[PDB]
Scaffold this active site. Sequence first.
Site, PDB file in Angstrom:
ATOM      1  N   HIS A  45      54.169   5.529  34.191  1.00  0.00           N
ATOM      2  CA  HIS A  45      55.351   5.092  34.915  1.00  0.00           C
ATOM      3  C   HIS A  45      54.938   3.880  35.729  1.00  0.00           C
ATOM      4  O   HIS A  45      53.769   3.508  35.735  1.00  0.00           O
ATOM      5  CB  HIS A  45      55.853   6.194  35.855  1.00  0.00           C
TER       6      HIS A  45
ATOM      7  N   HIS B 224      50.976   3.096  36.204  1.00  0.00           N
ATOM      8  CA  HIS B 224      50.100   4.249  36.344  1.00  0.00           C
ATOM      9  C   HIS B 224      50.103   5.071  35.061  1.00  0.00           C
ATOM     10  O   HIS B 224      51.144   5.573  34.646  1.00  0.00           O
ATOM     11  CB  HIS B 224      50.571   5.130  37.501  1.00  0.00           C
TER      12      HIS B 224
ATOM     13  N   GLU C  29      51.362  -0.420  44.687  1.00  0.00           N
ATOM     14  CA  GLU C  29      50.988   0.570  45.683  1.00  0.00           C
ATOM     15  C   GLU C  29      49.623   0.195  46.229  1.00  0.00           C
ATOM     16  O   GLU C  29      49.439   0.094  47.443  1.00  0.00           O
ATOM     17  CB  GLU C  29      50.987   1.955  45.056  1.00  0.00           C
TER      18      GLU C  29
ATOM     19  N   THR D 105      50.615   9.720  44.513  1.00  0.00           N
ATOM     20  CA  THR D 105      51.251   8.865  45.514  1.00  0.00           C
ATOM     21  C   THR D 105      52.644   9.360  45.904  1.00  0.00           C
ATOM     22  O   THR D 105      53.200   8.949  46.922  1.00  0.00           O
ATOM     23  CB  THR D 105      51.324   7.409  45.015  1.00  0.00           C
TER      24      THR D 105
ATOM     25  N   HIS E 260      63.088   8.864  40.944  1.00  0.00           N
ATOM     26  CA  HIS E 260      62.211   8.058  41.792  1.00  0.00           C
ATOM     27  C   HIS E 260      61.451   7.035  40.956  1.00  0.00           C
ATOM     28  O   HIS E 260      60.809   6.130  41.485  1.00  0.00           O
ATOM     29  CB  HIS E 260      61.239   8.955  42.568  1.00  0.00           C
TER      30      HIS E 260
ATOM     31  N   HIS F 101      55.720   1.439  39.553  1.00  0.00           N
ATOM     32  CA  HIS F 101      56.331   1.263  40.862  1.00  0.00           C
ATOM     33  C   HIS F 101      56.526  -0.225  41.087  1.00  0.00           C
ATOM     34  O   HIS F 101      55.613  -1.019  40.857  1.00  0.00           O
ATOM     35  CB  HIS F 101      55.421   1.818  41.961  1.00  0.00           C
TER      36      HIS F 101
END
Length: 258
Positions: free
Chosen positions: A92, A117, A104, A196, A62, A94
């Site tokens: 990591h 993050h 996010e 999240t 993911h 997103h």
Amino acid sequence: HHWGYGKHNGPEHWHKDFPIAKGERQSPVDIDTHTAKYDPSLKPLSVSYDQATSLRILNLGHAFNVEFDDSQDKAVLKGGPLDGTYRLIQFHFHWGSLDGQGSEHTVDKKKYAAELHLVHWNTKYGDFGKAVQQPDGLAVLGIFLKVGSAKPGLQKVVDVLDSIKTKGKSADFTNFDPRGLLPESLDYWTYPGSLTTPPLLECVTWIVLKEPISVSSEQVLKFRKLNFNGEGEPEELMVDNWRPAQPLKNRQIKASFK
Ligand SMILES: [Zn+2]
């Protein structure tokens, strides 16, 4: 069959397996800059990453993580709204399929190309596993990425992604200095939140930096070449691995600046 970011297993489906998805302190949220309250009581952030020891970079399916040695207080976060010492365990990102989406958290509904993050856990709890079960167990530093000039300190991460293209792949990733990913200013907003991704536990104290850090289109493009799938399986590009903003509900966002 499990959670993901697809049309049949995306964020809107998570509540079926993780009821806390409809909880009272879920993340991310939209930061309304005119409603956030300046708190003179908040102390400056203290980021001590000079002794950080990165170990490996892994494709979790993911997202990909860059793990650090958290057996001692080598890389820690203190100050700000925090009480105690929080050790860095992994970071990591997103990101989206287009430059206009990917973050996010949003600021006045504005979406950034990606969000970094940096996850830390409260040492008073012993280990990460115990920390996620506490309301003040984790402290996540969120940094926005906008597309523009290249970020030198990020290239090392970008160049090794080819070696961990598919889920389950890992590679040694030593001597990486996370200080190269920080913006000039440490002004921030903070609010009580969750993870999240599942299991969506409400154990986070979010510290979102006001100043974004610029990365080049070429750098972000390489993030988009990763795969959600494992080797030998049908290819599905790892993009748009972000959760939409959740209701703020009974919470107040505080700012360290005015
Ligand atoms: Zn994250």
